[PDB]
Design an enzyme around this catalytic site. Structure first.
Site, PDB file in Angstrom:
ATOM      1  N   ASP A  32      -2.907  -6.291   0.372  1.00  0.00           N
ATOM      2  CA  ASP A  32      -3.114  -5.835  -1.001  1.00  0.00           C
ATOM      3  C   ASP A  32      -4.178  -4.734  -1.083  1.00  0.00           C
ATOM      4  O   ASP A  32      -4.799  -4.562  -2.126  1.00  0.00           O
ATOM      5  CB  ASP A  32      -3.465  -7.044  -1.897  1.00  0.00           C
ATOM      6  CG  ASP A  32      -3.075  -6.893  -3.381  1.00  0.00           C
ATOM      7  OD1 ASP A  32      -2.356  -5.946  -3.783  1.00  0.00           O
ATOM      8  OD2 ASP A  32      -3.491  -7.811  -4.156  1.00  0.00           O
ATOM      9  N   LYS A  67      -5.956  -1.330  -1.788  1.00  0.00           N
ATOM     10  CA  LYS A  67      -5.838  -0.150  -2.639  1.00  0.00           C
ATOM     11  C   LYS A  67      -7.165  -0.010  -3.384  1.00  0.00           C
ATOM     12  O   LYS A  67      -7.893  -0.999  -3.511  1.00  0.00           O
ATOM     13  CB  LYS A  67      -4.663  -0.225  -3.618  1.00  0.00           C
ATOM     14  CG  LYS A  67      -4.616  -1.487  -4.460  1.00  0.00           C
ATOM     15  CD  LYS A  67      -3.375  -1.506  -5.341  1.00  0.00           C
ATOM     16  CE  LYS A  67      -3.202  -2.818  -6.069  1.00  0.00           C
ATOM     17  NZ  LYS A  67      -1.933  -2.863  -6.868  1.00  0.00           N
ATOM     18  N   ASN A 101      -8.304  -2.554  -5.976  1.00  0.00           N
ATOM     19  CA  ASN A 101      -8.648  -3.894  -5.520  1.00  0.00           C
ATOM     20  C   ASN A 101      -9.969  -3.937  -4.764  1.00  0.00           C
ATOM     21  O   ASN A 101     -10.299  -4.964  -4.159  1.00  0.00           O
ATOM     22  CB  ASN A 101      -7.521  -4.478  -4.662  1.00  0.00           C
ATOM     23  CG  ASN A 101      -6.334  -4.925  -5.483  1.00  0.00           C
ATOM     24  OD1 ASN A 101      -6.387  -4.961  -6.718  1.00  0.00           O
ATOM     25  ND2 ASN A 101      -5.265  -5.300  -4.811  1.00  0.00           N
ATOM     26  N   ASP A 106      -9.329 -10.051  -4.325  1.00  0.00           N
ATOM     27  CA  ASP A 106      -7.993 -10.563  -4.591  1.00  0.00           C
ATOM     28  C   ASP A 106      -7.321 -10.996  -3.300  1.00  0.00           C
ATOM     29  O   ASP A 106      -7.180 -10.197  -2.365  1.00  0.00           O
ATOM     30  CB  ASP A 106      -7.134  -9.485  -5.234  1.00  0.00           C
ATOM     31  CG  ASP A 106      -7.757  -8.908  -6.476  1.00  0.00           C
ATOM     32  OD1 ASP A 106      -7.394  -7.763  -6.821  1.00  0.00           O
ATOM     33  OD2 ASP A 106      -8.609  -9.588  -7.096  1.00  0.00           O
ATOM     34  N   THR A 166       2.008  -2.660  -3.008  1.00  0.00           N
ATOM     35  CA  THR A 166       2.033  -1.600  -4.001  1.00  0.00           C
ATOM     36  C   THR A 166       2.702  -0.386  -3.372  1.00  0.00           C
ATOM     37  O   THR A 166       2.420  -0.077  -2.215  1.00  0.00           O
ATOM     38  CB  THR A 166       0.599  -1.301  -4.448  1.00  0.00           C
ATOM     39  OG1 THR A 166       0.038  -2.498  -5.010  1.00  0.00           O
ATOM     40  CG2 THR A 166       0.535  -0.187  -5.478  1.00  0.00           C
TER      41      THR A 166
END
Ligand code: AO8
Ligand code: CL
Lengths: 353, 18
Positions: A169, A171, A174, A187, A204
């Site tokens: 995850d 990015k 985050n 997260d 994503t």
């Protein structure tokens, strides 16, 4: 060769010490993984201050603990919405990971509890906001600034991967910035224990590795691909693969072609070509020398890995902070009530939380 | 420019998971 005797010895010793650290950290993680803690506070112990973020399953609020006065970020998940959106396993797994890990760039879970309606995870409040906001505002980060953040991600992934955790995850949205300018990862909904391979389509679009797009079984190397995307985006101000629609992004990702701004150094482009490598037999982080191919790359030659870990490097950027409870680095949201039902909802599904 | 192409993509805001 590239190193003389003193430098080779020092590098060898450093790499062995990393192995020794990670073996101990894995032992500690597995103890907490096998015996997770639960029910360490209650809702009436906190005052609600402001909503920091919202999602389809719940909200994150700035709260103030009544007894200590400390501020925290409280993630509130609506149990019925979690069930409807098929997120039970992700929610339980996120809490189990957060209570078991320990690393200076991973957010600390201080309390967790549940009631008839909701699940609650009370985490340290990270007041600097998302890297995303700062990146879009400043435009792009200079290479030393990008490198300071990248080094923290390298160490964090080195830690997580030693625990057999794939992150999936990464990015700028985050990554939060703390009061000292260092990164916090919060997260863990997509993280998974994977010693071998896994198959879920998740992530994503801009950050998806080609093997995910192509519906392959994949491994921890997807995180090193994503690091390449992140470093590129930090240094350019935009990601390497973008388009109006995801399908066109995916075509670019799998193509094997990437283009760079003229201001990127040659060292940076070399690192990125080796992270953004579609061929898994050639991708840095996935070779015989593991994370060392990344940590020993020329672009990181000025990085003192231990000093980063110890948080002794002066950060390039310190977010504005007018005091405890300052929320100026977060967006403004409409404030909704926290409704708690008279009847327990979804007790069976969340018995382990 | 590439930056202009990025603006034109409409994907300059926060990106959701798939
Ligand atoms: O609400 S969050 O910012 N959300 C995390 C980052 N935002 C996720 C995101 C935002 C936009 C698009 C995709 C993903 C958050 C969560 C957990 C602990 C926190 C601690 N201090 C402050 C905020 C915290
Ligand atoms: Cl946005």
């Amino acid at each position: 060769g590239h190193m003389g005797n003193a430098a080779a010895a020092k590098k060898g010793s450093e790499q062995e010490s990393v192995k020794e650290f990670l073996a101990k950290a894995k032992e500690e993680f597995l103890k907490k993984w096998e015996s997770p803690s639960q029910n360490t506070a209650q809702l009436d112990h906190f005052d609600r201050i402001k909503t920091l973020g919202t999602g389809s399953f719940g909200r994150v609020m700035l709260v103030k603990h009544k007894e200590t006065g400390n501020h925290y970020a409280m993630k509130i998940l609506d149990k019925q919405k979690v069930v409807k959106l098929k997120q039970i396993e992700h929610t339980l797994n996120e809490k189990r990971i957060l209570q078991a890990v320990n690393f200076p760039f991973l957010v600390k879970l201080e309390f967790s509890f549940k009631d008839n309606s909701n699940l609650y995870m009370v985490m340290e409040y990270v007041p600097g906001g998302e890297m995303f906001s700062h990146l879009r505002r400043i435009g792009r980060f200079s290479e030393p600034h990008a490198r300071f953040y990248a080094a923290q991600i390298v160490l964090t992934f080195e830690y997580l991967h030693s625990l057999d955790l794939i992150y999936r995850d990464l990015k700028p949205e985050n990554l939060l910035i703390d009061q000292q300018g260092y990164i916090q990862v919060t997260d863990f909904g997509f993280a998974k224990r994977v010693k071998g391979r896994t198959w879920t389509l998740c992530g994503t679009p801009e950050y998806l590795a080609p093997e995910i797009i192509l519906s392959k079984g994949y491994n921890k190397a997807v995180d090193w691909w994503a690091l390449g995307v992140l470093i590129y985006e930090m240094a350019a101000g935009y990601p390497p693969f973008f388009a109006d629609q995801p399908i066109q992004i995916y075509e670019k990702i799998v193509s094997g072609k990437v283009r760079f701004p003229s201001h990127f150094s040659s060292d940076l482009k070399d690192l990125l070509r080796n992270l953004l490598q579609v061929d898994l037999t050639k991708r840095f982080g996935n070779l015989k020398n593991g994370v060392n191919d990344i940590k020993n790359h020329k672009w990181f030659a000025t990085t003192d890995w231990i000093a980063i870990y110890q948080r002794k490097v002066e950060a390039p950027f310190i977010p504005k902070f007018k005091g405890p409870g300052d929320t100026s680095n977060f967006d403004d949201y409409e404030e909704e009530e926290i409704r708690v039902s008279i009847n327990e909802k979804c007790g069976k599904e969340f018995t382990e939380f | 420019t590439t930056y202009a192409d990025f603006i034109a993509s409409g994907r300059t805001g926060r990106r959701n998971s798939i």
